[PDB]
């Protein structure tokens, strides 16, 4: 119970921090509230599915830290199926396509859609990844919701509806719930609009064979009995020489430093002595997590592939319970399955139903989208509503409502005496993901090595070599994508020519 560092939380970020500190020769303890490690990742194993990721699952190019960590732990990836055509279902009909966005044929609509994605990335380039409150128009952008920004930018309903689906799927929240500054930061710090939304060459390209929960489980194996499960932390006292960390089951740990590797608002579950400084005290009441039910419907065969659909469906409309799906069949071609997300207000609205009722609605939806009666014949179903988790608060990650990132964002990873902050939310590249978890856990561990005098300051932040297994292709645009006007730019050109 005496150690160098207590890590509070045994998700990927606390496990990555604990491993680094252990590898450097320090004595670490990880206090995990649950009876398992992995946190917002959770790999269920049973005979009907073999294994299935019910939390975080996908990785992709440019996520080099999780790929390197997982590789070193003996894990392998495989590519999510994107051989056959994607489907965009809009106004009750399905339109097959290939590429990052469904094709738009109407020239006016085309300009508006082109301008929308272009402008999201243009604004993102004004926003520093490590300091979004330093953007030149940070206040103006943080004081409006994403809804207000789509209202201003989108001169077509078509573009506004697609943009809405994009926000809801990327951050499991509604356009009117989230700040425009924070959402534009969140997309740019993932590499931009194409990279975040893509399967091939993007965030959803791959999964781990056997499930992502193995990352945290295999580090727990390396650490032995240093991971204490069912130890929720209730109290941290920094008034004396060594920090004292108390758990709910009545144990006391003493350490030189602590890393908090839990979602920022879950800091509220810990009583602090002395009290936190004013800005962190209020920050942790201002930063909710989003809302999602991850649902996986199993079938005898991946029947959609025979119709030349890959299983990816972008599904618009209020009545659809799931707005986005991917094929979740095993790489061997068996345990055929569709993964779908029930997003944001729908996660709250449909949580009232039973599991069997949600399975029925999802099969009825997929049968219509795929024009396939076979979708009404599931062989098994698994789901997880992350809104119910006391020790997560939601999924995938924390969002910032209007006005909060500029006022309180500076303190998200600011140390509090001998407490340092990990967790994906404090990352600067793919924050909200497993990648951001590794970045933040290793960065917080190195802050402590630096505090101890073990490494110089310039080693706190460390670049990551690009994976040789999952290389990234650049995201490119065409001259016409770059230079074609927006709708109001065209109207300005028309008004001028009319003169």
Ligand X SMILES: c1ccc2oc(-c3ncc[nH]3)cc2c1
Q: Which residues bind ligand ISN (CB under 6 A)?
A: 58, 169-170, 196-197, 203-204, 324, 326
Cα–Cα dist 178/439, whole Å: 24
For residue 51, the partner it binds in ligand C15, its own copies, ligand X, none, with Cβ less than 5 to 8 A by kind, is none
Q: Examine residue 189 and tell whether it contacts ligand X (CB under 6 A).
A: no
Q: Of 49-57, 65-73, 288-296, 452-460, which segment contacts its own copies by CB under 8 A? A: 288-296
Of the two residues 156 and 325, which places its CB atom closer to ligand FAD in the complex? 325
Cα–Cα dist 497/404, whole Å: 44
Instruction: Note the Cα 457 to chain centre separation in Å.
Output: 29
> Which residues have a Cβ under 8 Å from the Cβ of 181 and sit 6 or more positions away?
127, 132, 133, 135, 138, 141, 142, 405, 406
Q: Examine residue 176 and tell whether it contacts its own copies (CB under 8 A).
A: yes
Query: Which has the closest alpha carbon to 207: 356, 347, 326, 40?
Result: 326
Residue from 43, 77, 199, 212 touching ligand X (CB under 6 A): that is: 199
∠ Cα 322 324 328 (to 5°)? 105
| Residue 118: how many other CB atoms lie within 10 Å | 17
Q: Examine residue 199 and tell whether it contacts ligand FAD (CB under 6 A).
A: no
Q: Examine residue 192 and tell whether it contacts ligand X (CB under 6 A).
A: no
Tell me the Ramachandran region of residue 178: left when phi exceeds 0, alpha when psi lies from -120 to 50, beta otherwise.
Answer: beta
Of the two residues 85 and 176, which places its CB atom closer to ligand C15 in the complex? 176
Q: How far apart are the first and last CA of the chain?
A: 81
| Cα distances (angstroms) measured from residue 188 to each of 234, 307, 436 | 36, 35, 14
Q: Examine residue 111 and tell whether it contacts its own copies (CB under 8 A).
A: no
Q: Examine residue 485 and tell whether it contacts ligand C15 (CB under 6 A).
A: no
Helix (H, G, I), strand (E, B) or coil at 18: helix
For residue 10, the partner it binds in ligand FAD, its own copies, ligand X, none, with Cβ less than 5 to 8 A by kind, is ligand FAD
43: its two tokens:
């790999």
Binding mask 63-92 for ligand X (x = CB under 6 A): -----------------------x------
Bridge partners of 93? 90
Residue from 266, 365, 405, 449 touching its own copies (CB under 8 A): that is: 266
- Is residue 303 within 8 Å of 338, Cβ to Cβ? no
Residue from 101, 116, 155, 366 touching ligand C15 (CB under 6 A): that is: 155
Site for its own copies in 412-441 (CB under 8 A): none
Of the two residues 155 and 182, which places its CB atom closer to ligand C15 in the complex? 155
Residue owning tokens 């014949």: 377
Residue 100 CB-density burial (10 A; 0-12 exposed, 13-18 middle, 19+ buried): middle
> Which residues have a Cβ under 8 Å from the Cβ of 85 and sit 6 or more positions away?
96, 97, 98, 308, 309, 310
Cα–Cα dist 329/379, whole Å: 13
Q: Examine residue 265 and tell whether it contacts ligand FAD (CB under 6 A).
A: no
Rg of the chain taking only CA atoms, in angstroms: 23
For residue 170, the partner it binds in ligand ISN, ligand FAD, ligand X, none, with Cβ less than 5 to 8 A by kind, is ligand ISN
Q: Examine residue 396 and tell whether it contacts ligand X (CB under 6 A).
A: no
Q: Of 164-172, 210-218, 300-308, 419-427, which segment contacts ligand X by CB under 6 A? A: 164-172
Binding mask 123-162 for its own copies (x = CB under 8 A): --------------------xxx-xx--------------
- Is residue 361 within 8 Å of 350, Cβ to Cβ? yes
What is the full DSSP assignment across 401-443?
-TTHHHHHGGGTT--BTTEEE-SGGG-SSSTTSHHHHHHHHHH
Write down the least CB distance from residue 61 to ligand FAD, Å: 13
Write down the least CB distance from residue 12 to ligand FAD, Å: 4
Site for ligand FAD in 378-417 (CB under 6 A): 386, 391-392, 395-397
Q: Examine residue 322 and tell whether it contacts ligand FAD (CB under 6 A).
A: no
Q: Examine residue 492 and tell whether it contacts ligand C15 (CB under 6 A).
A: no
Q: Examine residue 312 and tell whether it contacts ligand X (CB under 6 A).
A: yes
Q: Of 117-125, 129-137, 200-208, 401-409, which segment contacts its own copies by CB under 8 A? A: 401-409
Site residues (CB under 8 A) for its own copies?
Answer: 143-145, 147-148, 174, 176-177, 232, 234-235, 248, 250, 265-266, 268-272, 275-279, 281-282, 285-289, 291, 345, 348, 351, 385, 387-390, 393-394, 401-404, 407-408
Site residues (CB under 6 A) for ligand C15?
Answer: 151-152, 155, 488
Site residues (CB under 6 A) for ligand X?
Answer: 86, 100-101, 162, 165-166, 169, 197-199, 312, 314, 324
């Amino acid at each position: 119970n005496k150690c160098d560092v207590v890590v509070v939380g045994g998700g990927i970020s606390g496990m990555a921090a604990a491993k680094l500190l252990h590898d450097s020769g320090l004595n670490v303890v990880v206090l995990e509230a649950r009876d398992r490690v992995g946190g917002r990742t959770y790999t269920l194993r049973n005979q009907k599915v073999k294994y299935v990721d019910l939390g975080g699952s996908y990785v992709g190019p440019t996520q080099n830290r999780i790929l390197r960590l997982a590789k070193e732990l003996g894990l392998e990836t495989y590519k999510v199926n994107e051989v056959e055509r994607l489907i965009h279902h809009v106004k009750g009909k399905s339109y097959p396509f290939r590429g990052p966005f469904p094709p738009v044929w109407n020239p006016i609509t085309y300009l508006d859609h082109n301008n929308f994605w272009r402008t999201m990335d243009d604004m993102g380039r004004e926003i520093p990844s490590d300091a979004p409150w330093k953007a030149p128009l940070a206040e103006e952008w943080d004081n409006m919701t994403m809804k207000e920004l789509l209202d201003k930018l989108c001169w077509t309903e078509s573009a506004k509806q697609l943009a809405t689906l994009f926000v809801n799927l990327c951050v499991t929240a509604e356009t009117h719930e989230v700040s425009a500054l924070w959402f534009l930061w969140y997309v740019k710090q993932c590499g931009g609009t194409t990279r975040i939304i893509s399967t091939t060459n993007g965030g959803q390209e791959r999964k781990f064979v056997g499930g992502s929960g193995q990352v945290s489980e295999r580090i727990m194996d390396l650490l032995g009995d240093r991971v204490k499960l069912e130890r929720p932390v209730i109290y941290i006292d920094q008034t004396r020489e060594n920090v004292l960390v108390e758990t709910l089951n009545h144990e006391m740990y003493e350490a030189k430093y602590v890393i908090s590797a839990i979602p920022p608002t879950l800091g509220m579950k810990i009583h602090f002595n002395p009290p936190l400084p004013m800005m962190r005290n209020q920050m942790i009441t201002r930063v909710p997590l989003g809302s999602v039910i991850k649902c996986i419907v199993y079938y005898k065969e991946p029947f959609w592939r025979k119709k030349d659909y890959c299983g990816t469906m972008i599904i618009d409309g209020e009545e659809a319970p799931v707005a986005y799906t991917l094929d979740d069949t095993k790489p061997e071609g068996n345990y055929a399955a569709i993964m779908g997300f029930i997003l944001a207000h729908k996660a709250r609205k449909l949580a009232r139903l039973t599991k069997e009722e949600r399975l029925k609605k999802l099969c009825e939806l997929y049968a219509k989208v795929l024009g396939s009666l076979e979708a009404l014949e599931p062989v098994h179903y698994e789901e997880k509503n992350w809104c119910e988790e006391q020790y997560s608060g939601g999924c995938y990650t924390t969002y910032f409502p209007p006005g909060i990132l500029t006022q309180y964002g500076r303190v998200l990873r600011q140390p509090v005496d001998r407490i340092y902050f990990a967790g994906t939310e404090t990352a600067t590249h793919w924050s909200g993901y497993m990648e951001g978890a590794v970045e933040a856990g290793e960065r917080a561990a190195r802050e402590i090595l630096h505090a101890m005098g073990k490494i110089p300051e310039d080693e706190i932040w460390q670049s990551e070599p690009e994976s040789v297994d999952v290389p990234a292709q650049p995201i490119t645009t065409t001259f016409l994508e770059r230079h074609l006007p927006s709708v109001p730019g065209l109207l300005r050109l028309i008004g001028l020519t009319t003169i």
